[PDB]
Symmetry: C3
Subunit: 253 residues, 3 copies
Amino acid sequence: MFEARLVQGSILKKVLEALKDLINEACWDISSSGVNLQSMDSSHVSLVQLTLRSEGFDTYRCDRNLAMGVNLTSMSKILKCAGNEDIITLRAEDNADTLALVFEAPNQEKVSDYEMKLMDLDVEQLGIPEQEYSCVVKMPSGEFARICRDLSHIGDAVVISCAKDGVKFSASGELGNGNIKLSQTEEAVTIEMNEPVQLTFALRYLNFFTKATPLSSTVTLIMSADVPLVVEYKIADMGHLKYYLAPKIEDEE
Amino acid sequence: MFEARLVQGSILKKVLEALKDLINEACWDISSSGVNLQSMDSSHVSLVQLTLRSEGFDTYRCDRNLAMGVNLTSMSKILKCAGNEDIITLRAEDNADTLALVFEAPNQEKVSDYEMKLMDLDVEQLGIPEQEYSCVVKMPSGEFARICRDLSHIGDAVVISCAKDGVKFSASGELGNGNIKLSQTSEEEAVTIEMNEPVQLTFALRYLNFFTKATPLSSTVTLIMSADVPLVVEYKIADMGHLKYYLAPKIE
Amino acid sequence: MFEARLVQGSILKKVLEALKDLINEACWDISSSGVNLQSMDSSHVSLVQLTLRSEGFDTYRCDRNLAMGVNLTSMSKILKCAGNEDIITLRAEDNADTLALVFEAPNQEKVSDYEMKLMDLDVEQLGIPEQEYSCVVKMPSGEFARICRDLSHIGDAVVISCAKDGVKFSASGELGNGNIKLSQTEAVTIEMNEPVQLTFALRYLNFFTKATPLSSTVTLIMSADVPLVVEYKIADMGHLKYYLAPKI
């Protein structure tokens, strides 16, 4: 029997909003340490990893490890039925056909109970990338979302350049080009540059990642020459939601 | 001549917002006791009845009885031109070919005057259904709107079960199922339940979600359920009347 | 080098918001006196005149006079990238193929920089109708916008009537007709020197009111033998004026 009670149910609400536009189906890995989810988007240039530690929950019981195949569009629909202050309890039997979600209103005349059907998913084992930390940018999550939104008007790809304690985002298209330069100062921008890095990413996928913005005031960019970019959002006390993105490749000279 | 002055004009604004989705053309029955409207909705599934009592207007004069054919979409468009604080006056001569709507801003330096062409309608003649009151639920209208919108993500129909202390709303569909249980409350945030005989009834969420467009008219909604007669979903308008929606529990 | 620094960047955001649906491409004339723009709209029905005086800028430099061909759609998209509190700087070389737009945020650690290609424009000159002031109406810009939006549901044209009484807006159409009567009073001012009654296309008025964010008030200047003038005062820097000939 798996049962987990989360007092701030909005966390779960926001997590599904941040996943659903990116991936349809995913396998939720449940165990004694908590909830873990890993999946790629359909064209496999992008990976998502979610961690919710058992201690972040107000109640946590996991008798046996589960892998729940979940239609995320379905689960998103159910979670839109929970209010922002609701207490949410997940519950599942030992070889799970269905996942139960219970929503309790903050003052208690109202209780909702949903039964979500689980699906069958092919799981292909994914290497989570080795992390090199060549440059690390911590900044406000809104500002990062706004940068990505802005440069989408200019072009479809952003060049991220990290150099001696400044970072620059660049784009170009038929109307012209632009760039946004951030310098070092919950309003703080911090740039930590161990080796300079310059890479090109698809704005389409960065704009999906920023659907996670409501989970945190700050976002961390981890960029390295040799690895996918990491975009990370800390979730409360519980864990994180991390997005990995391969650099766009390049033309040949 | 018919003339009615209504100080809270936002009432008519809200009434038209609540009807315009549901109904294209309808007849407004004007009499000295007030304004009455009865229609099947445009898909001929649910029945709508509107009541505005003459007492609720600041000024009311009706010389002879009118039946006004109204395009509600037109009337809706005209009423979007009224401010929420406007005093609205309705006026029609007895050869009733146009309806006039006068909007006075409260600072008396703006006045709008619209003349709506009336329509010639072949009105379906309708009785209002027998009401049986097996079960009556009063609840916050927003909560009821929220419940219907939610469940419509799950399934196409809600099953309403009622017992003495509590009411349950259920739906089910391909993705799974759900239910929302409301307990009776210890003023307009209360859920009160009068259960005279138990009831378990199924209704189309699509039609319920049209009904809840009347939510702006009242902070509470009343559900009147019976096994043998149409469900009544009812919104009290100020002190002057009601907007009621009817939906059959069976095809019978 | 042309260079102009504007502390309230929102002024340019709003000005492009107000022009971009009306005009696809237009000519920006740069002088020592300031920025000037004159264009017919896409359909060659109304005339737009924009004036931003050099005095209004925190920094202004014009070495040689410029006429910059500008795609308003492109310049609009770029100004979507400035924050409302951003400080905006315009820069061009003297034979300018590109215009630069620099956005500095209030927290002084973000700076954005944009280069727009300039259009090769066959630049008209039109001439500005001289104004008679038979009637002048001053009212809240919001009220005026709501009047034109409202009357659009009724009909495609509005009849504007001015008497010392007040001003009346009328429209007539398939579903019926309506009028709105304003009287002298967030104030409504009516200078009526000579009575005017004229008919305008609501399509164009609903475009003009895209300028509403620029001012809490709009001025209508009406006269029998000239275009209607719809004017929005910009800060203290200048105005955005729209001109529309009546229907016959």
